[PDB]
Amino acid sequence: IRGDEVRQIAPGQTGKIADYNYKLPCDFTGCVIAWNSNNLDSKVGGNYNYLYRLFRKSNLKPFERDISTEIYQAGSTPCNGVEGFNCYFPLQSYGFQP
Amino acid sequence: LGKLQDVVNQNAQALNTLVKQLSSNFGAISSVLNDILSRLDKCEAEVQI
Amino acid sequence: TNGVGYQPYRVVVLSFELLHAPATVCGPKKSTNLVKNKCVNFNFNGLTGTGVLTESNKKFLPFQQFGRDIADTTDAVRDPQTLEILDITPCSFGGVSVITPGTNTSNQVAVLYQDVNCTEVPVAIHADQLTPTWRVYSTGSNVFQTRAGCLIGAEHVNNSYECDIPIGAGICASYQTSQSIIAYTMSL
Amino acid sequence: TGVLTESNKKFLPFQQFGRDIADTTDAVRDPQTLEILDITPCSFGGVSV
Amino acid sequence: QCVNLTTRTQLPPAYTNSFTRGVYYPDKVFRSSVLHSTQDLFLPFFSNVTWFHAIHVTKRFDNPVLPFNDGVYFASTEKSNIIRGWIFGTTLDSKTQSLLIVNNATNVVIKVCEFQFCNDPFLGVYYHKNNKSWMESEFRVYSSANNCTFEYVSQPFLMDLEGKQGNFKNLREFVFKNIDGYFKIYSKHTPINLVRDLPQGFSALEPLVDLPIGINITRFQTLLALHRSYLTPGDSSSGWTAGAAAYYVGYLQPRTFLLKYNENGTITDAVDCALDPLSETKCTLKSFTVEKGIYQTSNFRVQPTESIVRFPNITNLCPFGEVFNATRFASVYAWNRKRISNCVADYSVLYNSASFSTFKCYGVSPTKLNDLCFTNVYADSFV
Ligand SMILES: C=CC1=C(C)/C(=C/c2[nH]c(/C=C3N=C(/C=C4\NC(=O)C(C)=C4C=C)C(C)=C\3CCC(=O)O)c(CCC(=O)O)c2C)NC1=O
Ligand SMILES: *[C@@H]1O[C@H](CO)[C@@H](O[C@@H]2O[C@H](CO)[C@@H](O)[C@H](O)[C@H]2NC(C)=O)[C@H](O)[C@H]1NC(C)=O
Ligand SMILES: CCCCC/C=C\C/C=C/CCCCCCCC(=O)O
Ligand SMILES: *[C@@H]1O[C@H](CO)[C@@H](O)[C@H](O)[C@H]1NC(C)=O
Ligand SMILES: *[C@@H]1O[C@H](CO)[C@@H](O)[C@H](O)[C@H]1NC(C)=O
Ligand SMILES: *[C@@H]1O[C@H](CO)[C@@H](O)[C@H](O)[C@H]1NC(C)=O
Ligand SMILES: *[C@@H]1O[C@H](CO)[C@@H](O)[C@H](O)[C@H]1NC(C)=O
Ligand SMILES: *[C@@H]1O[C@H](CO)[C@@H](O)[C@H](O)[C@H]1NC(C)=O
Ligand SMILES: *[C@@H]1O[C@H](CO)[C@@H](O)[C@H](O)[C@H]1NC(C)=O
Ligand SMILES: *[C@@H]1O[C@H](CO)[C@@H](O)[C@H](O)[C@H]1NC(C)=O
Ligand SMILES: *[C@@H]1O[C@H](CO)[C@@H](O)[C@H](O)[C@H]1NC(C)=O
Ligand SMILES: *[C@@H]1O[C@H](CO)[C@@H](O)[C@H](O)[C@H]1NC(C)=O
Ligand SMILES: *[C@@H]1O[C@H](CO)[C@@H](O)[C@H](O)[C@H]1NC(C)=O
């Protein structure tokens, strides 16, 4: 993830990561380790291999995974699985410059 | 008949005091289950409850 | 170009209070039509809960939304959409007593619903939401009204005997010999 | 802390500990030598002076 | 490639009564001679469990897409091992990950995988002509498998996949549930000699697996193994005889139970609290025997079934772009303060662009900010 979102890896948090990508329980025995990975996952011109889900219908359950790439209908009209106005691709790319 | 009336009054007063005692927080953030369960998830609400 | 500790940080502090006064800043939820007189989970302006909603009369000054009783539990709430006062009651009540001959004899039982008329037992007990096995003990032919309450599952007998299982208000129940539970006024 | 003794208990393969009415652990499966050991307090009440 | 069955004689769904079934160990702890109380997802006693069966001569082979509701009790009576797998998922369309448990007569395989499932999948069995035995040359479950994040191909084995005629000999009971991304399966196999609906007896379903699939499950279906021999006419869509097996599906609900652990550590009896007044008294008194008398009993009988939300109808999105996307902030000594009212604090708009180094909330759990209304909102802004 990015640094600013490391705080979201904890029980009872909210945000992109703690709602749409990775959720932790509060009956959670275990522990969390995070370390800066610059000059290992960031390259010149931007590293776009790492993605994160930006739009979802509802929040995730704890330890639930969602790899679906279906188009997110933000507005009223169904856009029928093609990108367009008021429909977005739910996965966005981190831009990790060094 | 002060004795019998005293008995009845004692019982009624005890029950009313028991009802009144539900307003005490006992260290929790509130004395109402609904407020605790709405402000906090079970994560933090378990200890208060 | 200075260190991260010296870099500028923009800060906003959002101060508010909850569940104590009328609210205009709401979350991104969608309301639902009102279902009254049913054990239901409700959420009024973020105050969640479960119970039975009914209509009543209360004079709420414009700066008041909730009302609290002696026990401090919220009892009256102003509905934000349709401006009216609704009273919350628990969707159950104490006063259910189970009469039985002891196991190793039979599994039949009787139920005494205390201080309820036999006409209004189902609404009081919310038998619509109860299991099928609880509904047979809610209404039938063995329904008997007493000064204590309504007794179900035992046939009323005009005869009088000694007290085997005391019930109340001069009523005692026993296990006759097909085999069934009887309820009768005691013999002094 | 306590006193370990040997005993007889049928532990299914997914069970390691055993708990009594008071919820304190009373039987433990020794990981190295597969056997059940009972833990008792190393003292007892009943001493009068 | 996959073939859709065309010959069907369908009846309305059948029901039966599940009595004192579906009890499982709730923990991996040994307790002996103890009356232990618990609350969890359990199958209520004396429940209307749905009945399905495959028998021939009326050419039913029923296997619909049933719904999954926070836990399921499955129980199959069989002798020839017809009922031989399950498919779980949310849409079963390859747009979402789906779970597949299949015993293909040599291995039991568990896959969490984006499957383009058939419409009426069947695992197949075939009485071979080149040799007088049973073995299957058809595996008709899915058409594609991509982005495939789990695998439990087991050790090889061999099983009596033959078609036996007579009386049932195996009752296999399973409890599935999905909690915190963990698929818990409890299992029990017992020999029974009955050709009826659910037998008389108490089971003690042991924990089988706790798989980490981490998916959303709302529907399933069963994978039945087609019989096929040289005594049936027609093509694959007609030339198949049904099996001779039956299954039953329940639906777990949150219930409080009493359980009795015997001297050897096994569950032998239980009480469904909130079933009938007598069980309610056994449950309140914490015993399996009640002597003659009258007992005051607590309130477990009624449980909630629906939820209501009643919020003000306000449509004006809240000024997030004026406090966060402000051209200029205030100096900390003259810190700005802004009243906020008549809002819908969706705050998902900030996800697109704004990233916050610190976001700490006091007096409120962050998860509950979507389920609340705030009275006197002030934004104090500075640098
Ligand atoms: C489908 C998933 C599947 C599961 C979960 C499974 C579990 C399972 N099956 C077993 C035996 C066995 N399992 C089967 C067959 C089955 N058992 C079933 O759950 C099903 C659906 C069938 C086929 C219809 C048989 C025939 C035995 C041996 C019975 C015996 O030898 O008496 C055992 C005990 C193994 C041992 O004691 O060494 C386990 C744990 N086997 C499977 O194939
Ligand atoms: C798991 O899958 C189900 C089915 O897709 C989701 O429930 C549906 O969500 C949509 C909105 O996204 C609603 O229109 C449907 O009415 C819902 N159906 C039911 C029965 O609730 C569910 O949201 C998914 N669970 C999670 C955590 O994402
Ligand atoms: C215009 C301000 C409205 C104020 C509403 C007040 C309280 C309800 C919303 C609370 C959270 C504020 C947004 C913080 C988003 C953090 C998500 C993240 O990036 O991790
Ligand atoms: C919206 O709110 C108003 C008053 O606040 C109320 O009269 C009305 O019933 C609500 N619902 C709709 C659809 O307007
Ligand atoms: C309910 O019972 C009370 C006293 O028994 C009686 O006054 C009242 O009329 C009854 N109401 C009905 C509808 O029967
Ligand atoms: C459900 O079970 C009850 C008995 O507990 C029975 O009265 C009822 O008819 C059953 N309903 C269905 C649809 O099976
Ligand atoms: C008891 O007496 C009343 C009238 O005195 C009568 O109506 C009633 O039928 C009697 N009970 C039975 C079971 O017959
Ligand atoms: C090591 O473990 C095995 C079984 O786990 C046990 O039999 C053995 O006694 C232990 N000690 C040594 C030295 O191997
Ligand atoms: C089965 O037949 C084809 C595939 O062979 C499929 O497109 C169709 O949807 C299926 N028929 C029905 C009634 O579902
Ligand atoms: C099906 O059975 C065959 C037997 O050779 C085995 O190779 C295979 O692993 C089984 N299917 C899967 C998906 O493993
Ligand atoms: C999911 O499958 C599609 C099919 O091409 C592929 O493009 C995509 O990269 C896969 N995503 C993951 C996380 O495997
Ligand atoms: C407990 O296990 C032993 C040996 O397996 C057996 O003799 C005994 O019968 C079992 N206890 C009961 C009540 O059956
Ligand atoms: C805030 O500013 C950024 C950059 O101009 C823009 O991408 C984003 O849409 C804005 N978000 C809001 C809520 O105004």
Author numbering:
A (entry chain B): 402 to 499
B (entry chain C): 945 to 993
C (entry chain A): 500 to 676, 689 to 699
D (entry chain B): 549 to 597
E (entry chain A): 14 to 70, 76 to 401
Task: Give the original sentences from the paper that presented this experimental model.
The spike (S) protein of coronaviruses is responsible for interaction with cellular receptors and fusion with the target cell membrane. The S protein of SARS-CoV-2 is a large, 1273 residue, type I fusion protein, that can be processed by host proteases into two parts, S1 and S2. The spike (S) protein of SARS-CoV-2 has been observed in three distinct pre-fusion conformations: locked, closed and open. To overcome this challenge, based on the locked SARS-CoV-2 S-R/PP structure, we engineered cysteines residues replacing positions D427 and V987 to generate a new disulfide-stabilized S protein S-R/x3.
Further 3D classification after symmetry expansion revealed that locked S-R/x3 spike protomers adopt two distinct conformations that differ primarily at domain D, we will refer to these conformations as “locked-1” and “locked-2”. In the locked-2 conformation, residues 617–641 in the locked-2 protomer are ordered and can be clearly identifiable in cryo-EM density. In the locked-2 structure, 617–641 loop refolds into two short alpha helices, and the sidechains of F318 and R319 at the domain C/D junction reorient. These structural changes allow formation of new electrostatic cation-π interactions between R319 and aromatic residues W633 and F592 (dashed red lines in Fig 4B) and formation of hydrophobic interactions between residues in the 617–641 loop and the hydrophobic core of domain D formed by the beta-sheet structure. The locked-1 and locked-2 conformations differ primarily at residues 617–641 within domain D, and this structural perturbation is associated with differences in the FPPR motif and in residues around 318–319 which are located in the junction region connecting domain C and D. Despite their differences, locked-1 and locked-2 conformations have in common that the 617–641 loop interacts with the domain D hydrophobic core and with residues at the domain C/D junction such as F318, R319 and F592. We performed cryo-EM imaging of the remaining trimers, finding that they had transitioned into the “closed” conformation, and that linoleic acid was no longer bound in the RBD. This suggests that both the locked-1 and locked-2 conformations are metastable at pH 7.4, and spontaneously transition into the closed conformation.
